[PDB]
Amino acid sequence: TLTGLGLTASSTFTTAAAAKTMIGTIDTALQTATNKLASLGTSSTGLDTHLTFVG
């Protein structure tokens, strides 16, 4: 969600300086989202390996 990515429902920019700051904010949001999805993918591979072992 937006709060899980470090943003808010009201996040925006009203000036060129605020947009220059928002560049780094969105950079952090994309980085944390890709780290979260990477952990979910590793968890899915771990579930698949455990399913093979259980069989």
Partner 1 sequence: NALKSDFDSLRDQITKAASNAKFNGVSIANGSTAKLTFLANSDGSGFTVTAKTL
34 binds partner 1 (CB under 8 A): no
* Rounded Cα–Cα distance for residues 55 and 44 (Å): 17
Q: Given the rule CB under 8 A, which of 5-13, 16-24, 31-39, 44-52 is the region that contacts partner 1?
A: 16-24
17 binds partner 1 (CB under 8 A): no
* Rounded Cα–Cα distance for residues 53 and 40 (Å): 20
Among 20, 34, 38, 43, binds partner 1 (CB under 8 A): 20
Tokens of 53: 């072992």
Among 9, 23, 51, 54, binds partner 1 (CB under 8 A): 23
Helix spans in 1-55 (H) = 16-54
